[PDB]
């Protein structure tokens, strides 16, 4: 068949198909009656008002003047000359494609629109200035070019639809004829996805009709259908579009299927009638029997029928006669329902067949038949008791006998064209054999304006208060794979959806990432030194993520192949205790653990598709900023930092000291031979040395009342004490290969943009152990040459705390691991960095955070801001 | 019904034009001013007020007396 | 694929598809150029005329105000406010269906229309003669119900089209998108045979345009398409429709297949271009490549390409770049042709795409590529010599390196919709294996009005003055099945078509069947007499038709089995001489022989679907009339007629003299031993008896100035010496089949009707040759009770003059076989009878007169008369 | 080219509101119609007599003279 995979459309007293399904489930009437005063104020002639046969009701779509011209690139001088049905069908088509879970502009295959349109009454006010000022008929040829035949080409231009763009144009069955033409085109393989429907919108916005004797219109405004008090119909206005796709493709791609269209049939009557404007029975019977013949369905299978049901005196017995003739092969008794949308919203002119198709597809998918209004007693020439049909007046649950629901929509034109479409139930979904939901998920939202982002967040806030909510891998997937990412964007990290609904109910100083996006050509990486680790560092990331797991497994097997370190036991199978913290405190174990964590976490961030420009390191962080630049291999790096750690374990005791003074003032104040260990900020510095004179310097620094801190380190680092251990790895260093770099390292021991040959020198890694890691000028050099965000790689938030204290120029630094306390929040922090990078504009595969086997669902669509465009000439 | 030799000419003009006509289900507003454009060979809101054969005869006689 | 089986269209400076194809073979430029003083007649403002930036050129269809309202039943007041595009597309739909060899309402399956209208231009001079009266909502309701979308539903109503009536509407690709939608409906089984096209003509007739250096219009008037002088196009007006069917069905039924649409593709540009109004390259390349792989073809195979080719300064290199990009899988250099019909006729917005499909299907069918006009050098951007394309300037033969002529039509909409249709050659048939053509054929013509019949006779007069005319069998099976039998009819019985053309050249002084058909409730079968035959009769009818052969069989087999005589030896194995002429006249080998001949002719006329109402006899015809009435069977009457003959043979004397005088005045002076044998007319009588007495009566009448002749017979029929035969046949009629008569029989020995008991008496046949014949009274009761046309069944025209010489007002009599002579022109005369009957209105099947496996053929269509329905200027 | 400081303001207002300047084939009668609509802030046959921007500026001062 041809699966329906999404739908949209404004309606009378509705603006969404879910704000229309809940006007059918509430058994509402959507007709908007008026009074005298507001009608002559709209422009009703003084003769039309106080006329004894002038009814004052119609079905009103809400805002016909309100177009979002900035979304589509249209100037606010060309969109004012656009027919309102063009604008409303543009917004409806964008809404229908977003309801499908797809984007029109970048579908793989070929997408084409088949859509109809009522008569453009907007020109009948446009000609008044266009002709009574210049007296030229040139405007009419422009109308030929860009109005009457060009609705579907305007949609296909502004949404970039490559497939067929055909304006079918039938009198009152235009929409269901368009659905049938779309099904034919999808089955002759002209397109791989279609969007099909219609529109009818009147630039006379609020009006009544002058009902006359024996006239097709009702003399009360209540469209009573299939009843003995039926006096006619009432004119509605509305748009509507469905999205169609072949059912094996739609079931392989994992879309949501409302109802599979199994059969369809269009025909005409052709002079089997007493006059041209009078329907026939046998042609309608041929259409119904042909659609059920093509579907492969006996008429003992269809359980609901949406008749046309306009409520006129003459068309009602003809349609029931045709339905009885086509269903006459059945043997059950009152087993099929009957209905009509036109009781609720009125008789739509062009969008009538797709309003019934939306109502019938919703009724098939949900599984409950709506309530026909105004019906309490049958018609004189219709016998419900000796027919297979019943008309219900309450919202009745739909259970079939065989277990499969089937339906059918009938539409009738005024020229004679008859269309019938036979649906079915969507096939057996299986959402029980899937692996479970990811623990946290990112909810991305985006818009072209801050107003549209605020309104979209408000719409998702009201959507998330419902009891019926989709999955967390069905939602978010549709928000990443099924929405286009615009400038003004926002993002949440959630675990349950109702608390997300509460958070978007605030949408003001609420804890979620939010802001405008930019070009953002590249990221910068910062790597952590020794002294900020915790317990179970990367435990969640190891079991959840596969790339981090693979890199850590290869590092652990590589370390255990040549050494006796019990890697994967000190992190994962280690109890949370201070004995473990003192077990991993020493330098013999801490350096390869930080190397493995920072390397595998860097491989994770490169697996998620961000491209680093500059990779600043810190002590051991430089050894792995080497390794991502590929200056030597992972085997060489891991065994050589093991050799380094087992040399620097033999070094004697030595302490650190922090000072809040710049290094020039420290070098003007230091007298003992104590080298500067690290320069990190203007107001932060670290000095080293053996612990006795370090404590003496700290106690004399207490006398000047300057802030200082012990850094909890056993061995002195970045001072002249380790000369023997520095020299003792030269003979183990020279036997391996060193490669010129690839990625732009800058060196923290010199504070200089470091070149492609001076990493390769085997004495640079000797003097890197001794000299101060002068971080601040390296950071200011990266900030000077580039202009980039920074992402720390490592356990602590130390380097982020240093960096967010430097003039970055509109930029920000971001951590990728919690600072120890919240190790349980490893999975939430790394997904809140990704949610915070994505808002600024960085390129991350957000669909990598999806789940096992995702599917698409129906979420709220874009929220177009309402700007009035109207020529408005009396 | 039985015609009266002037409204007879009016109804023969109506029938030879195209065939109260409101209660006849085969007629609309377009065919309404088709008939009306035939009867200027001798206010349209008054035609929507009432357009029976007696109504057209009364309106044509009143407009001729005017 | 989808076969194209017919086409029509009212084109610029043409009225048919053939008067457009003769202009494409004559290399004519069909664009009219006006002058100054005739634009101002219809109110073109003098500013437009005196403007120096003004070109006066349009490709005009001939008549736009002319409609035949009375054909479709449309009133002459409601037709005056139809758009002319509805009118022209009604006439084009009827003409295209007649060109297909079909009538739309009588097709077994279901038939869809898919057409495209343009912006109603009649509504501007339909709302200005309306705004005078206050129409607040009147103007809106006038537009809505009438002129929105009702071009494929005021055609499917009038032609009884019971299939999908869908109005596709793109900008200028409308008529090829319509063909692609129709080919989708014929493959997803929504219709069994479709029709698809478009129309664009409107009120603007004799109208010039303000050309713009910077618009899309040619500044001089001519469409120099694909050339160095490409300055735009010129607007045109036109119509067109093609008729489509599945190719297995069209090969099954033997239609005329112009071409087979083997693949097609429609798509849109997208936003992947500069703006809305700028054409793209990759979209057109996608359409061309998609069509050629849905056709199962390869870009080496296509030998003709009909490009869009408007003549504007931006569209021409873009389309050629797309074509080169799509055909860039080729290695052979300059093999495929290139053309644009807009050079000849102009750019008919919307219609462009079925005009260029008609041209391409004609070029595929015939094998002649027409000549692209106005082309001297390529454009600056267009590189011909390394592309695989060349442009012709003379109409060249088409003959590819393979035996199949394949093609492709491309039409591009202004909104961005592109269409490419690939047209393979029609699969050729084995023409030489077909059976030989029947020796004569009826050509029936019929029209709703006398003027339309005269015009449709003049059109076949013009048509048959050509060379290589179609098959005579296939013209007789297309004028009969393929045209709708109307009121005013005419009919021809031909053996060659060129003499038929020069005979239809004259109208008033031409002797064919002609008249007006009526209801014709029934037919009278006046069976003929006894002494009114000739040698070598029924020899043609024995071998031409098998119904006559089967009816003549089971007679002679029983006469050679039971008795010892053979009819076929006395007829077909006999010799043409006067020695046998007196030999077959004896009663022993005349009565059952003539009975079997008349029975065979009557069974033939029953086999051709005619209904007898009254059926009299004359001295043998009551026996075969009772046989056909079911009173006897063939064998039951066959034994007793031979018994009657060989008992009647023994009468020694007998002679009949013919006296032309009223029977009562004859009865005044006749004698006792002679009796009147036959009363046939008020001025006719036949007297029977011996020799000398009736000869003496003859010399008595000779001096009384009364003309008398003998009847050249030897026995005494209806006389006073057959009582011996009456006594002898009384030993017969023993327990024979005795049935009440099923049909209505007037007995000629009584002058009354025949009841259920008046004919089953066995003594009635005993006494039948005793009473005289009351033929005149039988006809007096015949045109008393009924009013029918009398078909004489017999081997002569003897009863025909005696029938027409009675009270035969409004009714005539028709002889089935020639009288005496034309013993070989029997085949021609019997079809001249069927031609004379079919015009009068009888329900004779005309298909039984065609050959073995006939086909359909494009002939001229109906000739609508022209009555002006407009409003004002 | 360089426009002369008053017709500069007028023609760049025209260009920023709409866009001989009309070399492209996409320009047509509807944008000509809106350009004819924005006139009276400071004959359409006379406008189409010369569609140049300097020519229509000239016609603006003859309309001011009128």
């Amino acid at each position: 068949g041809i699966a329906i995979i999404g739908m949209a459309g404004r309606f009378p007293q509705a603006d969404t198909v879910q704000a229309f399904w809940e006007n059918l489930l509430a058994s509402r009437e959507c007709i908007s009656f008026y009074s005298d005063e507001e009608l002559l104020a709209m422009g009703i002639s003084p003769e039309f008002v106080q006329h004894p046969d002038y009814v004052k009701a119609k079905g009103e779509v809400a805002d016909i003047d309100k177009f979002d011209a900035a979304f589509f690139g249209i100037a606010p001088r060309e969109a004012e000359l656009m027919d309102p049905q063009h604008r409303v069908l543009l917004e409806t088509a964008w809404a229908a494609f977003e309801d499908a879970g797809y984007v029109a502009a970048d579908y793989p295959g070929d997408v084409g629109i088949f859509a109809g349109k009522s008569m453009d009454s907007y020109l009948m006010l446009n000609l008044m200035p266009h002709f009574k000022r210049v007296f030229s008929s040139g405007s009419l040829q422009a109308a030929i070019g860009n109005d009457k035949d060009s609705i579907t080409t305007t949609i296909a231009y502004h949404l970039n639809l490559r497939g067929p763009a055909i304006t079918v144009q039938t009198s009152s069955s235009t929409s269901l004829v368009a659905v049938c033409v779309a099904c034919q085109s999808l089955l002759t393989w002209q397109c791989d996805m279609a969007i099909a429907g219609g529109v009818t919108l009147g630039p006379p916005a609020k009006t009544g009709y002058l009902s006359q004797e024996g006239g097709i219109t009702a003399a009360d405004g209540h469209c009573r259908a299939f009843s003995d008090n039926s006096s006619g119909f009432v004119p509605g206005t509305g748009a509507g579009l469905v999205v169609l796709k072949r059912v094996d493709e739609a079931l392989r791609d994992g879309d949501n299927i409302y109802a599979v269209i199994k059969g369809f049939a269009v025909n005409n009557d052709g002079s089997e009638k007493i006059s041209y404007t009078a329907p026939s029975v046998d042609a309608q019977a041929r259409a119904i029997a042909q659609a059920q013949r093509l579907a492969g369905l006996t008429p003992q299978d269809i359980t609901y029928v949406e008749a046309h049901g306009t409520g006129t005196r003459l068309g009602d017995p003809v349609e029931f006669s045709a339905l009885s003739q086509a269903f006459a092969g059945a043997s059950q008794k009152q087993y099929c329902a009957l209905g009509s949308v036109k009781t609720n919203i009125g008789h739509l002119d062009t969008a009538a067949g797709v309003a019934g198709l939306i109502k019938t597809a919703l009724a098939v998918q949900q599984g409950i038949i709506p309530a026909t209004l105004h019906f309490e007693r049958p018609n004189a020439q219709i016998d419900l008791t000796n027919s297979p049909f019943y008309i219900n007046t309450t919202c009745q649950p739909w259970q079939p006998e065989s277990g499969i629901r089937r339906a059918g929509v009938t539409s009738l034109g005024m020229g004679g064209t008859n269309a019938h479409v036979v649906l079915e139930q969507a096939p057996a979904v299986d959402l029980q054999a899937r692996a479970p939901v990811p623990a946290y998920s990112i909810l991305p939202f985006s818009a072209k304006t801050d107003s549209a982002l605020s309104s979209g967040l408000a719409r998702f806030a009201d959507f998330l208060q419902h009891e019926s909510l989709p999955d967390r891998r069905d939602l978010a997937w549709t928000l990443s794979q099924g929405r286009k990412a615009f400038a003004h964007r926002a993002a949440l990290v959630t675990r349950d959806l109702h608390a997300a609904g509460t958070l978007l109910q605030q949408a003001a100083t609420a804890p979620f990432a939010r802001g405008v996006a930019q070009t953002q050509l590249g990221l910068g990486l910062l790597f952590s030194g020794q002294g900020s680790q915790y317990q179970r560092m990367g435990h969640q990331l190891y079991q959840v993520w596969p790339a981090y797991a693979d890199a850590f497994d290869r590092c652990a097997t590589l370390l255990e192949r040549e050494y006796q370190l019990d890697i994967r036991h000190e992190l994962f199978r280690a109890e949370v205790s201070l004995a473990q913290g003192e077990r991993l405190a020493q330098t013999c174990l801490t350096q390869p653990l930080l190397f493995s964590v920072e390397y595998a976490l860097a491989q994770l961030w490169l697996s998620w598709g961000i491209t680093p420009t500059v990779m600043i390191g810190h002590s051991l962080g430089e050894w792995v900023a080497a390794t991502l630049a590929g200056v030597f291999s992972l085997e060489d790096a891991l065994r050589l930092v093991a050799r380094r750690a087992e040399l620097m374990h033999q070094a004697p005791s030595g302490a650190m000291l922090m000072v809040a003074l710049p290094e020039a003032q420290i070098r003007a104040l230091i007298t003992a031979p104590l080298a500067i260990a690290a320069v990190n900020a203007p107001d932060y510095s670290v000095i080293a040395g053996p612990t006795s004179e370090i404590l003496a310097v700290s106690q004399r620094l207490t006398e000047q009342n300057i802030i200082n801190k012990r850094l909890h380190t056993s061995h002195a680092f970045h001072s002249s004490m380790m000369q023997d251990a520095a020299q003792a790895l030269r003979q183990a260093f020279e036997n391996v290969r060193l490669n010129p770099p690839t990625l732009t390292i800058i060196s923290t021991v010199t504070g200089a943009h470091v070149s492609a040959d001076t990493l390769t020198t085997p004495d640079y890694w000797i003097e890197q152990m001794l000299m101060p890691v002068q971080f601040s000028a390296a950071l200011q050099e990266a900030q000077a040459t580039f202009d980039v965000d920074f992402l720390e790689i490592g356990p602590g938030a130390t380097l982020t705390q240093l960096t967010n204290g430097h003039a970055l120029g509109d930029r920000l630094a971001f951590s990728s691991l919690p600072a120890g306390a919240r190790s349980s929040d490893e999975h939430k922090h790394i997904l809140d960095t990704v949610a915070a990078l994505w808002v600024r504009g960085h390129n991350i595969d957000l669909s990598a955070f999806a789940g096992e086997q995702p599917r698409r669902v129906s979420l709220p669509t874009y929220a177009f801001d309402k700007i009035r465009y109207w020529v408005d000439s009396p | 019904a039985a015609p009266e030799s002037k409204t007879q000419r009016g109804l023969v003009a109506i029938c030879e034009a195209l065939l109260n006509f409101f209660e006849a289900g085969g007629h609309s507003l377009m065919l309404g001013m088709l008939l009306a454009q035939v009867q200027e060979r001798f206010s349209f809101f008054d035609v929507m007020e009432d357009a029976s054969v007696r109504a057209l005869a009364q309106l044509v006689e009143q407009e001729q007396q005017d």
Side-chain angles (χ1 to χ4, degrees), chain A residues 47-48 51-52 210 212-215 275 277 314, chain B residues 20 22-26 45 47-51:
Chain A
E47 38 97 11
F48 282 162
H51 184 262
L210 205 132
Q212 257 318 293
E213 284 89 70
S275 168
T277 63
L314 189 152
Chain B
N20 199 357
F22 278 150
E23 60 90 20
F45 312 125
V47 171
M48 283 74 75
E49 275 178 353
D50 211 354

Coordinates of all heavy atoms in Angstrom, one line a residue, chain A residues 47-48 51-52 210 212-215 275 277 314, chain B residues 20 22-26 45 47-51:
Chain A
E47 N -27.7 45.3 2.9 CA -28.8 44.5 2.3 C -28.6 43.0 2.8 O -29.7 42.4 3.1 CB -28.8 44.6 0.8 CG -27.5 44.7 0.1 CD -27.0 43.3 -0.4 OE1 -27.9 42.4 -0.4 OE2 -25.9 43.2 -0.8
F48 N -27.4 42.5 2.8 CA -27.2 41.1 3.3 C -27.7 41.0 4.8 O -28.3 40.1 5.2 CB -25.8 40.7 3.2 CG -25.4 40.3 1.8 CD1 -24.0 40.3 1.4 CD2 -26.3 40.0 0.9 CE1 -23.7 39.9 0.1 CE2 -26.0 39.6 -0.4 CZ -24.6 39.5 -0.8
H51 N -31.5 40.6 6.4 CA -32.2 39.8 5.4 C -32.8 38.6 6.1 O -32.2 37.9 6.8 CB -31.4 39.4 4.2 CG -32.1 38.7 3.1 ND1 -32.1 37.3 3.0 CD2 -32.8 39.2 2.1 CE1 -32.8 37.0 2.0 NE2 -33.3 38.1 1.4
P52 N -34.1 38.3 5.8 CA -34.8 37.2 6.5 C -34.3 35.8 6.2 O -34.6 34.9 7.0 CB -36.3 37.3 6.1 CG -36.2 38.1 4.8 CD -35.1 39.0 4.9
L210 N -26.3 34.0 1.7 CA -27.7 34.2 1.6 C -28.4 32.9 1.2 O -28.5 32.6 0.0 CB -28.0 35.3 0.6 CG -29.3 36.0 0.8 CD1 -29.1 37.6 0.8 CD2 -30.4 35.6 -0.2
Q212 N -31.2 30.3 0.1 CA -32.4 30.5 -0.7 C -33.3 29.3 -0.6 O -32.8 28.3 -0.1 CB -32.1 31.0 -2.1 CG -32.4 32.5 -2.3 CD -33.6 33.0 -1.6 OE1 -34.7 32.7 -2.0 NE2 -33.4 33.9 -0.6
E213 N -34.5 29.3 -1.2 CA -35.4 28.2 -1.2 C -34.8 27.0 -2.0 O -34.3 27.3 -3.1 CB -36.8 28.6 -1.7 CG -37.6 29.4 -0.8 CD -37.4 30.9 -0.9 OE1 -37.8 31.5 -1.9 OE2 -36.8 31.5 0.1
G214 N -34.8 25.8 -1.5 CA -34.3 24.6 -2.2 C -32.9 24.8 -2.5 O -32.4 24.0 -3.4
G215 N -32.2 25.7 -1.8 CA -30.7 25.9 -2.1 C -29.9 24.9 -1.3 O -30.3 24.4 -0.3
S275 N -29.6 16.0 -15.3 CA -29.0 17.3 -15.6 C -27.6 17.2 -15.0 O -27.2 16.3 -14.3 CB -29.8 18.4 -14.9 OG -29.0 19.6 -14.9
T277 N -25.7 19.0 -12.9 CA -25.5 19.1 -11.5 C -26.5 18.3 -10.7 O -27.3 18.8 -9.9 CB -25.5 20.6 -11.0 OG1 -26.9 21.1 -11.3 CG2 -24.6 21.4 -11.8
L314 N -31.0 16.1 -1.6 CA -31.0 15.2 -2.7 C -29.7 14.4 -2.8 O -29.8 13.2 -3.2 CB -31.0 16.1 -4.0 CG -31.2 15.5 -5.4 CD1 -31.9 16.6 -6.3 CD2 -29.9 15.2 -6.1
Chain B
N20 N -42.5 29.2 -8.9 CA -41.2 29.7 -8.5 C -40.1 28.8 -8.9 O -40.2 27.6 -8.8 CB -41.2 29.9 -7.0 CG -40.1 30.8 -6.5 OD1 -39.3 31.3 -7.3 ND2 -40.0 31.0 -5.2
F22 N -37.0 29.0 -7.6 CA -36.2 28.7 -6.4 C -36.4 27.3 -5.9 O -35.4 26.6 -5.6 CB -36.5 29.7 -5.3 CG -35.7 31.0 -5.5 CD1 -36.3 32.2 -4.9 CD2 -34.5 31.1 -6.1 CE1 -35.6 33.4 -5.1 CE2 -33.8 32.3 -6.2 CZ -34.4 33.4 -5.7
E23 N -37.6 26.8 -5.9 CA -37.9 25.5 -5.4 C -37.6 24.4 -6.4 O -37.5 23.2 -6.1 CB -39.4 25.4 -5.0 CG -40.4 25.6 -6.1 CD -40.8 24.4 -6.9 OE1 -40.6 23.3 -6.4 OE2 -41.3 24.5 -8.0
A24 N -37.3 24.8 -7.7 CA -36.8 23.8 -8.7 C -35.3 23.7 -8.4 O -34.5 24.6 -8.3 CB -37.0 24.4 -10.1
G25 N -34.9 22.4 -8.2 CA -33.5 22.1 -7.8 C -32.4 22.2 -8.8 O -31.3 22.1 -8.5
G26 N -32.8 22.5 -10.1 CA -31.8 22.6 -11.1 C -31.3 24.0 -11.5 O -30.7 24.2 -12.5
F45 N -31.1 42.4 -5.5 CA -31.4 42.0 -4.1 C -32.9 41.8 -3.8 O -33.2 40.9 -3.0 CB -30.8 43.0 -3.1 CG -29.4 43.4 -3.5 CD1 -29.1 44.8 -3.7 CD2 -28.4 42.5 -3.6 CE1 -27.8 45.2 -4.0 CE2 -27.1 42.9 -3.9 CZ -26.8 44.2 -4.1
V47 N -34.6 40.4 -6.1 CA -34.8 39.1 -6.7 C -34.4 38.0 -5.7 O -35.1 37.0 -5.6 CB -34.0 39.0 -8.0 CG1 -33.9 37.6 -8.6 CG2 -34.6 40.0 -9.1
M48 N -33.3 38.2 -5.0 CA -33.1 37.3 -3.8 C -34.1 37.4 -2.7 O -34.2 36.5 -1.9 CB -31.7 37.5 -3.2 CG -30.5 36.8 -4.0 SD -30.0 37.7 -5.5 CE -29.1 39.0 -4.7
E49 N -34.8 38.5 -2.6 CA -35.9 38.6 -1.6 C -37.0 37.7 -2.0 O -37.5 36.9 -1.2 CB -36.4 40.1 -1.6 CG -35.6 41.0 -0.6 CD -36.1 42.4 -0.6 OE1 -37.0 42.7 -1.4 OE2 -35.6 43.2 0.2
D50 N -37.5 37.8 -3.2 CA -38.5 36.9 -3.8 C -38.4 36.9 -5.3 O -38.4 38.0 -5.9 CB -39.9 37.3 -3.3 CG -40.8 36.1 -3.1 OD1 -40.4 34.9 -3.5 OD2 -42.0 36.2 -2.6
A51 N -38.4 35.7 -5.9 CA -38.3 35.6 -7.4 C -39.2 34.6 -7.9 O -38.9 33.8 -8.8 CB -36.9 35.4 -7.8

